[PDB]
């Protein structure tokens, strides 16, 4: 775990802070983890509530927090997860998927997206202007 | 006509999803996921199916006119085998004129529900006596218009199946074409039923979403569009077993497709993965072509992409706010941000990504909903302020949060 990594996690944990003392409410730990780029499941979050023991008031101190990020950060690998999630709609062996295939996928899995937001991104990814998309490339362009 | 209204709504959506492709035109609109396969037919043979159909119609216990039977079957059969949009609607319009209602029975007190699983009835029962508001959940089965359309479709499918020879497979291609066409019917009509959803909608899919099923292909799109119009609230997914949702309040029943944990499943369609899985599972028992294989892919990962790609997309998902860049400053509404009330956030550097994440985190910590927010928020000089009658500096940054 990098020293740089703790700097941002200290900063994130300053806010959400109740009593302004160093206690973070249990339920919000879920929220804070989701902001810091890790998506733990409904069950996996209960692991951190038990694995780091919980006995009522407080007990979710800052040291407990970056322990889980460490744990959770290890067993999850985000860029391959997104690549994996775009290959299922590959069906053709080749890296590209149809722009219509993409649009359909982005509508369904973008819950708080708008039609124009989805239209704009299908144009941006369609560099070639043919109606095919490099799914990796498209990821590449929304990682900037 | 009310179904011609819905139909028109659906034809747009299909044409919106087809914009890159532009394979849609007048009369032909492509149902998403329902490839059009049309192959050559002997013309008179159509009449064989036509008169079978017509007979079937009026020698069955259905609310159709006596002599209308010839008319109906002619319309239906042409409409199906030709992929003609106007005829598909006309057939639907006609049916609606025989006292077939294409709308849910408890017009406003019904929760339009979706079932795309196994034992809907069990789920439905728990769901029905869970609502504390006199609300009763409704499936596509409950719609008399839907059901009767499916009945006739079933009959033409069966004609093909048990009048044709697979042996001679130039005949198989005619079977595959008729199967393909009747498949897009069930597909179109599920988009009709789905454009009628309001408020909170329930979706039964045990074992997660099933890619390439009706929900994913035609229902979920129609439900998405309704949300961006503000007509539908939460789409609640019951992908766990029925017990887990037992003795739970109606609000708390189900989660979202995009949440972590929800599984995805396919019918084990791939050229070589069938075989990989075959010698790695012809070990115990085996696999039938329709056996659902649990993938290890995360739909949540696509949602995660958006959170780290679009600014304040997390306030949307987690707090149902819509932060847009305005004349100068971000304007904030309740999502989808077509409704009146408008609040503002000013940053001292509106393009810095560190800055957006900070005010983002701040808002998730202090406000549970939009209505709790002050009329103006400022992230300036490592301070956050707010103006709501009187200005206050709620927190300062010197490596941390010094509230006050």
Author numbering:
A (entry chain B): 5 to 148
B (entry chain A): 1968 to 2371
Q: Anything the authors wrote about it?
A:
Multifunctional autoprocessing repeats-in-toxin (MARTX) toxins, secreted by multiple Gram-negative bacteria, are primary virulence factors that promote initial colonization, dissemination, and lethality in a wide range of hosts, including humans. Previously, we reported that DUF1 and RID within MARTXVv are not uncoupled by activated CPD in host cells; rather, they are discharged as a duet (it is assumed that the DUF1-RID effector module acts as a functional unit). The data show that DUF1 acts as a RID-dependent transforming NADase domain (RDTND) that disrupts NAD+ homeostasis by hijacking calmodulin.
The duet interacted with CaM, regardless of the presence of Ca2+; indeed, it interacted more readily with Ca2+-free CaM. Subsequently, we determined the structure of DUF1-RIDCBD in complex with Ca2+-bound CaM or Ca2+-free CaM at a resolution of 2.82 Å and 2.90 Å, respectively. Consistent with the biochemical and structural analysis, these data suggest that the enzymatic activity of CaM-mediated DUF1 is independent of calcium. Taken together, these data demonstrate that DUF1 is transformed into a NAD(P)+-hydrolyzing enzyme by RID-dependent CaM-binding.
